[PDB]
Paper text:
Nucleosomes are substrates of the protein machineries responsible for DNA replication, recombination, transcription, repair, and chromosome segregation. Single particle cryo-EM provides an alternative way to determine atomic resolution structures without requiring crystals; however, nucleosomes tend to dissociate during cryogenic sample preparation, which apparently limits the resolution of structures of NCPs determined. Here, we overcome this hurdle by using a single-chain antibody fragment (scFv) to stabilize the nucleosome. In this work, we demonstrate that the scFv can be used to stabilize nucleosomes for determination of atomic resolution native-like nucleosome structures by cryo-EM.
We determine the cryo-EM structure of the human centromeric nucleosome containing CENP-A and a native α-satellite DNA sequence at 2.6 Å resolution. Indeed, scFv stabilized the NCP not only when exposed to increased salt concentration in solution but also during the vitrification process. We obtained a density map at an overall resolution of 2.6 Å for the scFv-NCPCENP-A, NAS complex and solved its structure. In both structures of the scFv-NCPCENP-A, NAS and scFv-NCPH3, W601 complexes, the residues in the variable loops of the scFv interact with the H2A–H2B region including the acidic patch. scFv residue Arg124 serves as an “anchor” by insertion into the pocket of the acidic patch, forming salt bridges as well as hydrogen bonds with acidic patch residues Glu61, Asp90, and Glu92 of H2A. Additional electrostatic interactions are formed between scFv Arg126 and Glu113 of H2B and between scFv Arg188 and Glu64 of H2A. Unique to this complex, many scFv residues form hydrogen bonds with residues in H2A and H2B, including scFv Asn52 and Tyr76 with H2A Glu91 and Asn94, respectively; scFv Tyr74 with H2A Glu91, scFv Ser123 with H2A Asp90, scFv Tyr54 and Ser127 with H2B Glu105 and H109, respectively; and scFv Tyr190 with H2A Glu64. These tight and specific interactions might help stabilize the nucleosome structure during cryo-sample preparation by preventing the first step of nucleosome dissociation, involving H2A–H2B interactions with the DNA end regions of the nucleosome. Comparison of our cryo-EM NCPCENP-A, NAS structure with the CENP-A NCP crystal structure consisting of a palindromic one-half of the human α-satellite DNA (PAS)18 revealed that the histone octamer conformations (in the defined regions of both structures) to be very similar, with a root mean square deviation of less than 0.6 Å; thus, scFv binding had little perturbation to the NCP structure.
Author numbering:
A (entry chain G): 9 to 116
B (entry chain B), H (entry chain F): 23 to 102
C (entry chain H): 31 to 124
D (entry chain A), I (entry chain E): 42 to 140
E (entry chain N): 23 to 141, 156 to 265
F (entry chain D): 30 to 124
G (entry chain C): 10 to 116
J (entry chain M): 23 to 142, 157 to 265
The structure:
DNA sequence: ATCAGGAAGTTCATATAAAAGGCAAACGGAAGCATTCTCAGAATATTCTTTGTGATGATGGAGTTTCACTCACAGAGCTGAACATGCCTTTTGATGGAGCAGTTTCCAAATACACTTTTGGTAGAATCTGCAGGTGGATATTGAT
DNA sequence: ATCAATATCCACCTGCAGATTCTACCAAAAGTGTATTTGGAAACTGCTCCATCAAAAGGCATGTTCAGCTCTGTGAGTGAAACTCCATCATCACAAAGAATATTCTGAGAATGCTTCCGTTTGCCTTTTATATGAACTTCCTGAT
């Protein structure tokens, strides 16, 4: 009858990442028997925060390289110039990212 | 010429300069070829195990990524 | 062909609100997709393991919160906890 | 009159990101190693599979050279010896080290 | 807890150079930048620069290029600061502040202060519209921090009692700092920002600063002195 | 009511009494063997779960368990574990 | 009123519980459904690994002239073996000690 | 006397002899105390996180084992 | 006339299995570290929790001394210096190393 | 594949010493023991000892304690055997065999042998009940190796062409080795064991041995010569 | 090659803590039958890997030199192990005791289930645009008087 | 304390490979009832951890000595970087072929669901035994000459 129009619960949570897709992936990923209502909201918020942090640091590195587009080296620099992000992505190799420019001081 | 000798001395030297090495002993090249052979054997064995369990005859990029991921060597940029 | 979903449009929406005039290459978008899937499976595995440790059948936002607090190092965990908490509190009043 | 070029070589290779091993020698090395596990059957390889495995192999080798050159400098040397690489593989352990 | 032990005052001659330590304790030393702030009582608070001891990476304000040099020591958990070519304007209090590498984090914990006593257009102007106001013991106080350019939410609030180090009140324009009661509340985004105290007390008599850290030269506010009967 | 608190102790003792008929085991060593069996169970079951999820399957079968064994055990250990599991499923399906 | 019950362990010729392994596979959130031969195969693999470590540890106990296996004996049996040391690489055995390891330069 | 000084010099020396060390510099004791403090902070933080999520006030052996297991330091002989 | 005893000390400590740090100092160290995370609240500790954490701590320390003494012998020394322990923690990485 | 390269034949004097190599390739060298077998054509095959190159651990037969010494070299993947005080009862072929540290694994791959001609005990005994037999090209032949004390299925079978290295047929008393056809079949446990060939050829003309490795002095069988018509 | 003598292995009592053995309850595994539903097999379209060939210039290989490094040794000076002696934190153990973790019931808010409708995400087009390559001036070494 | 040569860096043109933008459409998310059930709260219990006193001896702290180590410098000899020139092998582009992978439909065997019954497992008592400890005996291997 008076069926209200659909609002995405991403927009209800004020988020950009999909709460419904995160809920479906939790529900199909064999993690538990049940998934609460606030769990995909919380998880989509955490994933959006981490994405925003890395993209903003990589955009700052791209602007410091006088460039407009973010390439994998910009992500490599943004992650490896950061103690907490380097500890998080410790056993992670980024393709086409290169290395940090580290020369040992005794050689100079 | 064996295929491990296709990993040439300028390539090993170039990898070591990206590693920041100033001087490079002449005995390091066979050492590097042996280490590379051990690494590739351990990755390709698991990737072939994933490929054979999927009942395929083509090693895929996801098979390589799964083989690396189960060895604690997660690779970004090829799927997953 | 199959549908082959990803996080690319969502990473792009986040990118064009942290930097409105900055693009991203397709290889860097694939790396960000791999990052989001990796952190998803890491947090979901830790929350699953917590719910199994405490003999619970349901993963809730409290399990997600303590999995975030176990997995993220330092101030990263504190700001992710504040973001998840404010998203849940403005979701419940809606 | 010979000039030094190792410092310029290190400074350009630590800002480049391209692959340092040639694609076709690495490809036939990987295929020869793959033959010994598939019971003589020749599997196929996607191009992205070989690129992914070459990215992983070169990242492994560069990080191992960094950890071994720390050992070179710890012994008061400048020249990287194979005992440095062997000790760096021994200290990294079974997972991070060998393989 | 987190303490940034900083040295006592110095009575030095012009043309010389002064080092000052910021020996920190209570946290993992390489996980956090150490920022440096000059406080002249003619220009308020000014950001000098930071060092990040994880990789010894520095960044300086353009007003202090060549004047300040930041070094670190992982073994002693200490950050030093060179002050070369001392002049009459280099007579101030030099604070060292603890800031995470997180973009929304702010100057969390401050040093005691080092009183050194001698013997630019593309920056973001932070305009606090009340310079001073008077208050009762329970009424409402609202302070604005109108900004020049678009910082998104990277704005933080500080209170400074006289001859003391600043204390962090609010970070990220809304979030309360640790140990700050809910009487303090922040609002706004973009260029409009606000600071609000609900139940005024005796210890709320201080000077209230706003700091932006959205763009790479960090700028403070002019300050707002609050007198409470 | 004290709870159930199940373990692998009597099964490890049954295996010990046929590999060494006159050797006992201490309680701490039995606890370590219980931890070993739980760790290897979780490791193989997690790898087989990931295999069934990669290949878009809902079922963990003996083929997933077999390839998880080949992925997780090193060298000849995987070879003899595969022959033992294959012999057991053959003897089970024959009866 | 029905046939005499046989355990799946005795039907598979095993000592580890196929029924308990099946119930743990069902309740451990690994898949939606579990095949019939999967707990048989897994109980066989767990029994093989248990038998291998217990037999090596009993040999170490007999070489120590003792008739009871202790965590020191398990530590020796696991760490004197390439494949078992690689399997239990990031594993600490409580009250297991270390291997006797004096570098030959010091002698 | 601080509690990190309760990790005495004969205990650190005894741990180093079990590690097979012939001679032991006098500066190694504060180094060892710092490494032990970093290790215990990283383990106890996760164990307290598991304890607080279980809504308890007692750190259990299973909480310690879970904290070690998620750091790649699996311990046998205390449950699990 | 002083005799050597380091060799006999190593040979008896590498066949013993008991804990080498005293239980009550380790216990109050662990409780002081626990106070700084529980917001001032004193948690309780099971006895097996403290024993498990002491087993883990001593195993970590003994393995780190082995890996650092390999670095001592690599530099041509016999005396273990703190730079050996620091380099051994740096080469083990972030997970195996620090912490 | 797995191949164990071994030196050529040597003609030596009494009282001297022989160091013979067992250069190995095709596998991870430290994961496997290298076992040593003496073959005189009057006492059959005898087990000498092994070295385990993972930790340089050795174990010797009591007949060769002091007579033999085993060393290894990880850099060359070579295991050496040193024989001291050479006597006339040393005119034999010395094989080096590849064996895993698994308890049910057997001597998998063999070297070609080194003939050493010196120019002038409370263990388990294995009993080949036929010593020589005769059969045609289609008959079924059984061979039994009744044991002495007890071996719970730790028995393996080998065939040997004349002046060739032994080839593994069956391990763990029932399991087929790699590359062995299903004509060969083994059975038995405890003390009574049996070996069976179904469809004979000219390839089945060899000497058939049984090896126990249940107890630490490893003991071969007396041998059984089967020949085709 | 021979004495001195403590460290190490051996052996017998032997007690005692810890491990093996026995019984009852409850709980979970098996048997049997009905229902559902997953995936192997078969047929087939469509991608994408293999392989071949010409071009072509990019770059590795090989030989020579030389100088910058490694390595062995010696001596000066530091410093950690050994050792003796007192005394003080650790440990056992003991009762009490009480905080608190685990157990049992209940029921209500939350989660799954199913159907229907809308909508947004993705694959496939056409269209724009950052950047890498390429060619010249400011600038900062690098030798060299 | 300043000139020829060269690497580094910036200004600018542009071709294009790659990013961006625009359209069906289909899969999936959201809305709406509905029945199910999990876990939080409350009362209660017995477990086990915290804390305190005696004590006692075992282990640690402290100061000295010296011999064995670290460190720095030197010189002989070694070996790796630099440089050159070509020709070999890698790369790229394209056609094609076809092997192999992905898609779709079907049904049958295999997995689940549920009920009932019984065999197994576990917790709590009850013996009994291997191993640590103590003490006397024998050998070995280093220290000394």
């Amino acid at each position: 009858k008076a069926r209200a129009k659909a609002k995405t619960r991403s927009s209800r949570a004020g988020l950009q990442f999909p709460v419904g897709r995160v809920h479906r992936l939790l529900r199909k990923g064999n993690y538990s028997e049940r998934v609460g209502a606030g769990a995909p909201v919380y998880l989509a918020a955490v994933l959006e925060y981490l994405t925003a942090e890395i993209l903003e640091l990589a955009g700052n590195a791209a602007r410091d390289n006088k460039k407009t587009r973010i390439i994998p080296r910009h992500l490599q620099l943004a992650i490896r110039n950061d103690e907490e992000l380097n500890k998080l992505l410790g056993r992670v190799t980024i393709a086409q990212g290169g290395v940090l420019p580290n020369i040992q001081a005794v050689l100079l | 010429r064996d295929n491990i000798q296709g990993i040439t001395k300028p390539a090993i030297r170039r990898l070591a300069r990206r590693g920041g090495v100033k001087r490079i002993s002449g005995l390091i090249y066979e050492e590097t070829r042996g280490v590379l052979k051990v690494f590739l054997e351990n990755v390709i064995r698991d990737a072939v195990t994933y490929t054979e369990h999927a009942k395929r005859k083509t090693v895929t990029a996801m098979d390589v990524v799964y083989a690396l991921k189960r060895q604690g060597r997660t690779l970004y940029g090829f799927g997953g | 062909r199959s549908r082959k979903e990803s996080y690319s449009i969502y990473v792009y929406k986040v990118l064009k609100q942290v930097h409105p005039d900055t693009g991203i290459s397709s290889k860097a978008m694939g790396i960000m997709n791999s990052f989001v899937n990796d952190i998803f499976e890491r947090i979901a595995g830790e929350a699953s393991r917590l719910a199994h440790y405490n003999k619970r059948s349901t993963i809730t936002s409290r399990e997600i919160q303590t999995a975030v607090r176990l997995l993220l190092p330092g101030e990263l965990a504190k700001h992710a906890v504040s973001e998840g908490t404010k998203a849940v509190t403005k979701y419940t009043s809606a | 009159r010979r000039r030094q070029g190792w410092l310029k070589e290190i400074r350009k290779l630590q800002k480049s990101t391209h692959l340092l091993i040639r694609k076709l020698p690495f490809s036939r090395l990987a295929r020869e190693i793959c033959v010994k596990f598939t019971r003589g059957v020749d599997f196929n390889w996607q191009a992205q599979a070989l690129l992914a495995l070459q990215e992983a192999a070169e990242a492994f080798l560069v990080h191992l050279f960094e950890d071994a050159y720390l050992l070179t400098l710890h012994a008061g040397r400048v020249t990287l010896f194979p005992k440095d690489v062997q000790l760096a593989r021994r200290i990294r352990g079974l997972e991070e080290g060998l393989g | 807890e987190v303490q940034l032990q900083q040295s006592g005052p110095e009575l030095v001659e012009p043309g010389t150079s002064v080092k000052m330590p910021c020996k920190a304790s209570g946290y993992t030393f390489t996980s956090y930048t150490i920022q440096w702030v000059k406080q002249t009582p003619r220009q308020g608070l000014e950001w000098i620069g930071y060092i990040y001891p994880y990789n010894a990476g520095t960044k300086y304000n353009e007003k202090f290029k060549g004047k300040a040099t930041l070094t670190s020591d992982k073994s002693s958990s200490t950050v030093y600061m060179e002050l070369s070519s001392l002049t009459s304007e280099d007579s101030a209090v030099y604070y060292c502040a603890r800031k995470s590498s997180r973009l929304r984090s702010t100057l969390d914990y401050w040093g005691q202060g080092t009183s050194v006593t001698v013997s630019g257009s593309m920056d973001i102007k932070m305009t606090q519209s009340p310079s001073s106001m008077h208050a009762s013991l329970g009424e409402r106080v609202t302070i604005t921090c109108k900004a020049s350019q678009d910082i998104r939410s990277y704005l933080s609030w500080y209170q400074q009692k006289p001859w003391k180090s600043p204390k962090t009140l609010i970070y990220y324009a809304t979030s309360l700092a640790d140990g700050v009661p809910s009487r303090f509340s922040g609002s706004g985004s973009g260029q409009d920002f606000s600071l609000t105290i609900n139940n005024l007390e005796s210890d709320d008599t201080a000077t209230y600063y706003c700091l932006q850290h959205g763009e790479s030269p960090y700028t403070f506010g002019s300050g707002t002195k609050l007198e409470i009967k």
